[PDB]
From a paper:
These proteins, referred to as evasins, suppress chemokine-driven inflammation by binding and neutralizing multiple chemokines. Evasins 1 and 4 (EVA1 and EVA4) are homologous, with eight conserved Cys residues, and specifically bind subsets of CC-chemokines, whereas EVA3 has six Cys residues and specifically binds a subset of ELR+ CXC-chemokines. Members of the first class, which includes the class founder EVA3, bind one or more ELR+ CXC-chemokines, including CXCL1 and/or CXCL8, but not ELR− chemokines.
EVA3 was expressed and purified from Escherichia coli and crystallized readily. The two monomers are very similar, and the Cα of residues 13–56 can be overlaid with a root-mean-square deviation of 1.0 Å. Residues Leu57 to the C-terminal Arg66 are not visible in monomer B and are only visible in monomer A because of an extensive β-sheet interaction of this region of the protein with a symmetry-related monomer. Two extensive loop regions, composed of residues Ser28–Cys37 and Leu41–Lys47 join the two major β-strands, whereas a very short α-helix is present at the N-terminal region residues Ala14–Asn16. The short β2 strand, which interacts with β3, is held in place by a disulfide bridge between residues Cys26 and Cys39. The first loop, between strands β1 and β2, is rigidified by the presence of two other disulfide bridges between Cys33 and Cys50 and Cys37 and Cys22. The topology of EVA3 is that of an archetypal knottin cystine knot, with the Cys3–Cys6 disulfide bond (Cys33–Cys50 in EVA3) traversing the macrocycle created by Cys1–Cys4 (Cys22–Cys37 in EVA3) and Cys2–Cys5 (Cys26–Cys39 in EVA3) disulfide bonds. The crystal structure also contains a cadmium ion present in the crystallization solution that binds to the side-chain oxygen atoms of Glu60, carbonyl oxygen of Leu57, and carbonyl of Gly36 of the symmetry-related chain A molecule.
Author numbering: 13 to 66
The structure:
Amino acid sequence: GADNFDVVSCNKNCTSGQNECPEGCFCGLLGQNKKGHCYKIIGNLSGEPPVVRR
């Protein structure tokens, strides 16, 4: 089910080697760069009605 999951931002800068990302996120780096951003994997649940009252 790899096609069910998307990578999204976890809204934080990070550097490799330092445990800087929140749990459940990863530090995504481009190539040999030491600095990157925190990301996370999510799956969307579809089918929600257009309006929900709580």
